[PDB]
Amino acid sequence: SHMLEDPMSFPKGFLWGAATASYQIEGAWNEDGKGESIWDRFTHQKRNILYGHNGDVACDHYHRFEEDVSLMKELGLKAYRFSIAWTRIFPDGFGTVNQKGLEFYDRLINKLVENGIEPVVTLYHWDLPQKLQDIGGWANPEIVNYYFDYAMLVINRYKDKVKKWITFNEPYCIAFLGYFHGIHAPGIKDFKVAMDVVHSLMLSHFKVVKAVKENNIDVEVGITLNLTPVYLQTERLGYKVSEIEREMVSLSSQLDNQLFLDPVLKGSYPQKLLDYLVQKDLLDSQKALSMQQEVKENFIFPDFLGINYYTRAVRLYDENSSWIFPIRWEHPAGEYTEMGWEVFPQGLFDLLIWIKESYPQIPIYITENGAAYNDIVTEDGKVHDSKRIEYLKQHFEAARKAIENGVDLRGYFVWSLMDNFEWAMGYTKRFGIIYVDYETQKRIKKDSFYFYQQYIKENS
Amino acid sequence: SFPKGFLWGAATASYQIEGAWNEDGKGESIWDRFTHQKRNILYGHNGDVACDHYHRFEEDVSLMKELGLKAYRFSIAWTRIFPDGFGTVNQKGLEFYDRLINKLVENGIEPVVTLYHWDLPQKLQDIGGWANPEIVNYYFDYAMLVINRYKDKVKKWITFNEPYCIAFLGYFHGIHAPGIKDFKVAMDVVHSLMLSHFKVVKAVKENNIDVEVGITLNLTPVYLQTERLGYKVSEIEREMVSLSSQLDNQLFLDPVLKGSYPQKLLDYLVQKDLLDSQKALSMQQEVKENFIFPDFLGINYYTRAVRLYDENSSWIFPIRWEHPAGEYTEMGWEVFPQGLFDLLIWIKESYPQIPIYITENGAAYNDIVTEDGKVHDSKRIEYLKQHFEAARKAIENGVDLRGYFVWSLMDNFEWAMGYTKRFGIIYVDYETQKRIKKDSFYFYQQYIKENS
Ligand SMILES: [Cl-]
């Protein structure tokens, strides 16, 4: 008694893309006058990266970008997300502009446009100039202005061709992995410093959004957040959830998600979380107060939200925990990647519905999604990455379902176009749809490349 | 094929299933104590009732017969026999195990008894537990009483289940009873367990008692991440990861089968101030003096470990664990049947010839009872099928494997995880004590029939 409803289509113009970051692919770490970044410094020290790997060569993309753009054209990408290395432009962070750095991004952007691929630029993907770290890095309030001057130089240079700009990639990682856990550059280990960095990143973001809007620059500006939907083990077990468990697991999830979403989309930090941190002597009251006032004063709503989604977390209340919240993580049965991350496409759907229901209307791009498997090249030069294909297929379909349920999703960027340097894990994690043989720098298209090629064709 | 008479079984432990924790004069155990304190067990679960097997054992044996088990591995609760650890023997406790063993025999199921599966009398912990040298004698007297009582019907005896856990989880990590946190004490416990084991083996052999005695070890085969990635392995990584694996495996296998502890491990622990030099010396001397080879080795196998060298590690060895892609259970354990084959081959290659029993293997999945009263545990079936096939392959390659006990006959109290982990081929509804056969029960029923 119900006439067939057609499948929900991806909308016309949907940006099917792939994503990379400068330090992870470019190599050429000291070439053409490029300054030292915090990642150059970090990987050149012992005991920071698995196997002593570094990004000195990486995928050699600074040299091989033309081949890579040819592969993007073959794939049929609508868009390519990449980051600009600040140290190629301003080797010391500020001062004299390095013309050879501008010439590289000129050539890359021109090549993308020549090939009909929309460039999407991340301004900051973790590679702060070491000379700025020498004066405190993101903890130094003057950083906001140095970042702003860099960002506006490149926006003004490339705005004719680059219409979508991402201020920051994954500020959770920049702040907490870089300045609390110290497992990312610059390797600092101080929670209060990390919260200072959170705030610098938010003010930096707003300053760029404000300049773009006030000067009526015809580009869109957003920010990319890694979001982790949180589920209760107690509910998986079918038990009754206590008030204290709900509250503590909620607060723990606010550190991951709302700490960044709320300032960006609502103009305040999540007050219950700041209160908790003050009450636990993890954040000074005076700082909690000033950071809340400064976000209120400087808030401006952005043009889009970028989401990086890989997995979920399952948590429960545990007074014995050593974490900054009394929680532990549990291990639902299922399929896991080489990162030890659960394959959970339902989490992408749930997260997108939650954004739609909990925040003001805004265009959403999935700026990263992908999986690491231990790829083997066959004798006949193939990579039969069937599990990566299954992962992508299921997440693409979760995105379609989100669109069917009214989420304003406007693009989807697979992490990554090519295997690359995975930060403190070195080259040991391969996320590409293209395999890179690091001995030869040969690009080998994986089965997932051909899968995605056909998926784009069928969904555009 | 599986050899004629291969012991297809299932396994339980007393604290995990029995309940009746304070009935019929039973003494308090360290697990009664541990679960009665706050913040030791998920959700504040305890073993006070568990699966109520003390009361419902007749139903359970009927299910074992329906299943077609050749053997049933269970543990005896020391506190039901000697409530105070030594002294007065409790006749009601003996009566229970009499009834259980008689019922197993009546049904044609071979009883296989674990003498100690973690439930030390609290009165013995009160005088230092496994750290008190006199524990060897208290254990010995308990063990010989029950061996002599049941040797007409029970022909396979396991001195200890998982000494790694008894010592390190109970006395170093303190996440198992009795909740102590002292590495040097844990090493004293290791040694007490080894001497206890040898004293029972010696008495059985010296008195010519016609039963077989062994011990059950949880073994974790280790794999290098470096080799998974195809990189060259450094000598230092090989050395450090090897040491880390000796704590899991050789620390227990070497005394039991070769009459020494792994010297390289003891030397490392002494260097790191985790073992006193004089203790390392006396340990080796005493194991040499008391060593006697057992009748069989029990292995508990669930998963492997993938490790790599990392000087930044907080562990007692400079290693970290990696997470290979694949299927994982509710314990966070990789499904890795190749590990069972590799482990068995390694035992054959590395140790003197000895009969092996897999005394535990199984998996935890978040089972749902459907509205039609079934449990469609397809992943548990796939887990078991693959591990059975690994065991078959081991036999085909010359390993003297003589039986295989699925952990567990029924869902039960999983120690510090409480009832949140279900390992059974039979589901237990803890509200009603209903036993519900899972799909894995019928899979196994059919597998036994086809492989016997
Ligand atoms: Cl303009």
Residue numbers in the entry:
A (entry chain A): -6 to 453
B (entry chain B): 2 to 453
From the paper:
Bgl1 catalyses the final step of in the decomposition of cellulose, an unbranched glucose polymer that has attracted the attention of researchers in recent years as it is the most abundant renewable source of reduced carbon in the biosphere. Bgl1 is a member of glycosyl hydrolase family 1 (GH1 superfamily, EC 3.2.1.21) and the results showed that the 3D structure of Bgl1 follows the overall architecture of the GH1 family, with a classical (β/α)8 TIM-barrel fold. Bgl1 has a half-life of 250 h at 60°C and it has been shown to be a thermostable enzyme with a broad substrate specificity and saccharification ability that efficiently hydrolyses cellooligosaccharides to glucose. The catalytic site residues of the enzyme are two glutamic acid residues, Glu163 and Glu361, as in other enzymes that belong to the same family.
